[PDB]
Amino acid sequence: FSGSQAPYLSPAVPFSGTIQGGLQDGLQITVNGTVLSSSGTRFAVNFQTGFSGNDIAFHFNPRFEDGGYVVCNTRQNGSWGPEERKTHMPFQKGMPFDLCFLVQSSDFKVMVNGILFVQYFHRVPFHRVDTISVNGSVQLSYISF
Numbered sequence: 001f002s003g004s005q006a007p008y009l010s011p012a013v014p015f016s017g018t019i020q021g022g023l024q025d026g027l028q029i030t031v032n033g034t035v036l037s038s039s040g041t042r043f044a045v046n047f048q049t050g051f052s053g054n055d056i057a058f059h060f061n062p063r064f065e066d067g068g069y070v071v072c073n074t075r076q077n078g079s080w081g082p083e084e085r086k087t088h089m090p091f092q093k094g095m096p097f098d099l100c101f102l103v104q105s106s107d108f109k110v111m112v113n114g115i116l117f118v119q120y121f122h123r124v125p126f127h128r129v130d131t132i133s134v135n136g137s138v139q140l141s142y143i144s145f
């Protein structure tokens, strides 16, 4: 590791932890782990304000359902917005993955196993994000910065 916040090593799922200094343009956050085989049909990574879960700037939510698709959304003052759905599944049940979020001024760039998968254009100010959560059908090796 060569970043500036110590990695969360082998974090238990569900996980919620502080992002030191908050999201910043240029910050890269990696979630590295394995999708579980028979422990649910969904997982999510949430970039959120505090630990309540009612204000999530970016919810990245693969669903092994209806062919496999990924939901991208924002929750503000407790309410979900209109979902962006990509109708391709880049993960696989039982399989290891490397999931990398690069914060840019206009969007998150989301890379799955070294391929840019989606760009989520910010709906709310990313500076207000100070917490990352991961939940659902995954086990994690690390979350790094």
Ligand SMILES: CC(=O)N[C@@H]1[C@@H](O)[C@H](O[C@@H]2O[C@H](CO)[C@H](O)[C@H](O[C@@H]3O[C@H](CO)[C@@H](O[C@@H]4O[C@H](CO)[C@H](O)[C@H](O[C@@H]5O[C@H](CO)[C@@H](O[C@@H]6O[C@H](CO)[C@H](O)[C@H](O)[C@H]6O)[C@H](O)[C@H]5NC(C)=O)[C@H]4O)[C@H](O)[C@H]3NC(C)=O)[C@H]2O)[C@@H](CO)O[C@H]1O
Residues within 6 Å of the ligand: 014, 042, 044, 046, 053, 059, 061, 071, 073, 080, 081, 083, 135, 136
């Ligand atoms: C004229 C007419 O009659 N028209 C109707 C339409 O109105 C109707 O359309 C449907 O209308 C309903 C409302 O009535 C709704 O809008 C339907 O849309 C669906 O809405 C659901 C619920 O919001 C969507 O599912 C949710 O999606 C969001 C992202 O957008 C999240 O993925 C939600 O997942 C939850 O996420 C939480 C945070 O990560 C998580 O909680 C965490 O869990 C952790 C443990 O793992 C830990 O506990 C932590 O503390 C906690 O915060 C939850 O576990 C997680 N829940 C689940 C179940 O995973 C997700 O629930 C859904 O995607 C959306 N679908 C669509 C298509 O938009 C809308 O379809 C239609 C159809 O009925 O009929 C017409 O006739």
